[PDB]
């Protein structure tokens, strides 16, 4: 019964990251040694008009960024492991995320590395009003 | 209260095919009530698409039975190799009781999705 | 009773130190067993009884219990024989084992555990919890425990005999904890290790694996003790013993002799 969920092109990555002790560094070492990034993420459809703020309640892209199903970007939420947020749940479960179309091939890697500036609400570098 | 089928239906592999001669060789899975008057078979289980005839020698092995078959039953049992489609073949003209008995034995014996 | 340093008054019950404890306990045990059988047979419906002879037994039992007034030797005789055929007992002091018909018991013609519970309740003023009353169906492996020994069915020589084997934690505890500081130093006392090994022997036939290792550990200990003893003796004074005949203590036929019926 049930419903299948992952395509065979993700088995090694998901296993090796669900057994590791530091999921983040594990995934970074995986990529950094010739790995194929994760890839059945849910992809949205919208207007590419609105705030550049990736974290949002409703797909709000610009002509450059690209809306994604948030929950399917938190690696922690993807491998079914616990989150390092001291308390106590992932935030990207419920929202949408918008990633620069350039780097928006690997969503999980970006979500791991970059962060939104608290002021401009946008990615530090893509872009930020601060300084 | 009332129990339905204190059941002794073991399993055999035998012959079956699309026509009386298309009954080739060892590819059928028969459930058999080995009654008083010989081994009486009830249902046939295979992965082959559809087969109109099974071919099993008599209780004395003289003639090979020419038994036309039900339209196969569709269901997806599972094994370590994931899903596995199988087809259940009833001998056409079977009362509800033997249907129920065969279904009980099979479903309690083999896992489905 | 002179407990502490003052005299009290013992209300009742035995004082388990007099001249005849084990035997009086055996008598009391048989009494309770017979009482339970009687209650079982009398508290069952008559019409449900199939056999005519058994309705005759129950009927005349009610007779000889309440209607009659003095003894009737033949009834006692045939009832005692009935019990000896469908209840067979083995009694050491307050410690019993019963080999009984099973279908009779199911029908209610002899006593099962529930009857013992009821009898103890109204005639002993205690509640026998059912977590302490074992039960066995297959007669190969024997009684589940008797006199704090377990039974195992082992093929010895050319036939299949029963053997008793203790509880391993008990033997190890006995090995580690003593009650005098000269019972420590194994050098002086190897004899008690011999006795302990004699008690531990039948473990060797156990299908498990730590269990046999208990016995083999004891043997190797004895060897170690003898070696260090000769060493010490040669050390303090220079003599070496002339003859020992102790080598038969660390070799496993001296022990298995004890469970071979020919003495």
């Amino acid at each position: 019964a049930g419903n299948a969920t992952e395509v065979p092109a993700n088995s090694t990555v998901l296993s090796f990251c669900a057994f590791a002790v530091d999921a983040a560094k594990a995934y970074k070492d995986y990529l950094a040694s010739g790995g194929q990034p994760i890839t059945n993420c849910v992809k949205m459809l919208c207007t590419h008009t609105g705030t550049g703020q990736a974290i949002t309640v409703t797909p709000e892209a610009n002509m450059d960024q690209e809306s994604f199903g948030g929950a399917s970007c938190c690696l922690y939420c993807r491998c079914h492991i616990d989150h390092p947020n001291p308390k106590g749940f992932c935030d990207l479960k419920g929202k949408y995320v918008q990633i620069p179309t350039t780097c928006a091939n690997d969503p999980v890697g970006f979500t791991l590395k970059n962060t939104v500036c608290t002021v401009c609400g946008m990615w530090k570098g893509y872009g930020c009003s601060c300084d | 209260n009332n129990e339905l089928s204190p059941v002794a239906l073991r399993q055999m592999s035998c012959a079956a095919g699309t026509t009386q001669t298309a009954c080739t060789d060892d590819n059928a899975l028969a459930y058999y009530n080995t009654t008083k008057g010989g081994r009486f078979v009830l249902a046939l289980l295979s992965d082959l698409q559809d087969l109109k005839w099974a071919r099993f020698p008599k209780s004395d092995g003289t003639g090979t039975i020419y038994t036309e078959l039900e339209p196969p039953c569709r269901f997806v049992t599972d094994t370590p190799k994931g899903p596995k489609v199988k087809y259940l073949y009833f001998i056409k003209g079977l009362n509800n009781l033997n249907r129920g008995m065969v279904l009980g034995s099979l479903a309690a014996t083999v896992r489905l999705q | 009773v002179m407990c502490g340093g003052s005299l009290y008054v013992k209300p009742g019950g035995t004082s388990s130190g007099d001249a005849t404890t084990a035997y009086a306990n055996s008598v009391f045990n048989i009494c309770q067993a017979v009482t339970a059988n009687v209650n079982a047979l009398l508290s069952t419906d008559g019409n449900k009884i199939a056999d005519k002879y058994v309705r005759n037994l129950q009927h005349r039992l009610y007779e000889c219990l309440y209607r009659n007034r003095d003894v009737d030797t033949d009834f006692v005789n045939e009832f005692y024989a009935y019990l000896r055929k469908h209840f067979s007992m083995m009694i050491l002091s307050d410690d019993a084992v019963v080999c009984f018909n099973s279908t009779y018991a199911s029908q209610g013609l002899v006593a099962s555990i529930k009857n013992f519970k009821s009898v103890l309740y109204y005639q002993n003023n205690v509640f026998m919890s059912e977590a302490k009353c074992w039960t066995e169906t297959d007669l190969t492996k024997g009684p589940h425990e008797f006199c704090s020994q377990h039974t195992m069915l082992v093929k010895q020589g050319d036939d299949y005999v029963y053997l008793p084997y203790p509880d391993p934690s008990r033997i190890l505890g006995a090995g580690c904890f003593v009650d005098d500081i000269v019972k420590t130093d194994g050098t002086l006392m190897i004899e008690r290790f011999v006795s302990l090994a004699i008690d531990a022997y039948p473990l060797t036939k156990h299908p498990n694996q730590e269990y046999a290792d208990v016995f083999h550990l004891y043997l190797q200990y004895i060897r170690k003790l003898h070696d260090e003893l000769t060493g010490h003796m040669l050390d303090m004074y220079s003599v070496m013993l002339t003859n020992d005949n102790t080598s038969r203590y660390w070799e496993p036929e001296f022990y298995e002799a004890m469970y071979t019926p020919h003495t």
């Binding site: 019964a1 049930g2 419903n3 299948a4 969920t5 992952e6 395509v7 065979p8 088995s11 090694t12 990555v13 296993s15 090796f16 669900a18 057994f19 590791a20 002790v21 530091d22 594990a26 070492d29 995986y30 040694s33 849910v42 992809k43 949205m44 459809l45 409703t58 797909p59 199903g69 399917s72 939420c77 993807r78 079914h80 492991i81 616990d82 989150h83 106590g88 749940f89 479960k93 419920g94 929202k95 949408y96 | 994931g82 309690a108 999705q113 | 299908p207 498990n208 694996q209 730590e210 290792d213 083999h216 550990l217 190797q220 060897r223 070696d227 040669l234 220079s238 003599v239 070496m240 002339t242």
Partner: protein, 523 residues
Amino acid sequence: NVTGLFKDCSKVITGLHPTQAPTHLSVDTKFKTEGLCVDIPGIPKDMTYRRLISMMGFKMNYQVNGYPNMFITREEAIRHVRAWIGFDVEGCHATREAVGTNLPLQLGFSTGVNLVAVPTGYVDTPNNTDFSRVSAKPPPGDQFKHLIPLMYKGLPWNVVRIKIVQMLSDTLKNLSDRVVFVLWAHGFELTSMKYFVKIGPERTCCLCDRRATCFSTASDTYACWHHSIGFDYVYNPFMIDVQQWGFTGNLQSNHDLYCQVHGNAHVASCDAIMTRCLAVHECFVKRVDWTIEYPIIGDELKINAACRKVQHMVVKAALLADKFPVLHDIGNPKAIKCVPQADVEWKFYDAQPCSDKAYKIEELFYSYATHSDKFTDGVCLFWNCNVDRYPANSIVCRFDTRVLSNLNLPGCDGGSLYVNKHAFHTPAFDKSAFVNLKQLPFFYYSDSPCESHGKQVVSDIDYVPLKSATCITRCNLGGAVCRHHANEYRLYLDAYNMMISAGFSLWVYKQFDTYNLWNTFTR
């Protein structure tokens, strides 16, 4: 295609709101417009749903530079015996709020330990995932009925993983510095090892120096085997797949071929023991290799020196006692004389003749069935060879397989697998073999001068007061010392005791007697 990995098992039929659906295949289809997703504000996100997530089919065969392999080859496993531990698990199916997955229930290892754990699984919530307790039931198989009572005797998992770390730690602290699990139905065991395993780059212990094999989640620190109390994760196990090695049916029928010892009491540890027994057979019951080495753990070199001394002495004594014409050596692959000078004719036999010295080392596989009536001249010498009943003339030295020590490890089938340097496998021990011989009684033969000062004979050689009746070393009469002989006797007695406590047993032809050594002594 798809896999069974992370296959959902919830009974509800509706897909998930894309913003809380882990993948593009586990979304619902109203949002599925041409493989893409469109948010339909007519429906909101659920705020209560609990979907169990099956955890089977893990498939781990990666290549990262900082991380060590988890499945090792056959040679890397042969090298690291001492560290093998069987493993088997029993299962249970999920019932009401989900169906289609198994949960670990009873665990069993090569040691006779059996742990039971309450059924727990990985559940989701609108905010996160969750490790919680779920309801289950045993398999409908009849032979699995001995599992019905176990479903109410479980333990919370943390207790179980702590107990596991502790059991391993005090089984292996004195042998290896790792652990390799031998297993059969590889998949489900790998599934179960999600509960208490954690992998990652190689690390060294804290407050000790050996490689670290434990993890603590609370304090976040590692440990070796010795200093691991309160830690609850194995940090880098290794594995092995016995059935991968080209085997056919269930391991029951396969094991049943050779070992008639390990029966099947219906648990899991039984399967573990059978698996390890089989793995030992497949790699060790052959002929012994001489290229494989092992570290010493420990004290072993004393046992070796003792074996040297005792061999030299016993053979010299037997020769000088009976003066055999020919010495039929047996089982010696290197034609090296034990006693260095001996006028007796000295053969060499073996079932493995080397290249050189093959002209010396005649090929010979002994068996009393046949060669019983062949070497009826002189005497044989079965040093550590393993045959059936020995001929009535011989000087056998055979390792008893019943002793306990950390050197010999259980093998098949009842015979154990000694490990000193190169692992020797010896068959089971029995008495029928020695039906022609008798235990060598202890003694000590010397033949040399004495103390000195005197350097002559009666009576100017230094005497101290040793009174023992078995040091057959004239000069000796009760004062029997000549210092030299005395402390030599002490040394050799110590060595003999150590050797024979290590496990080895001695035997001699029935004709032996000590007196004729005295008769030799009279000069």
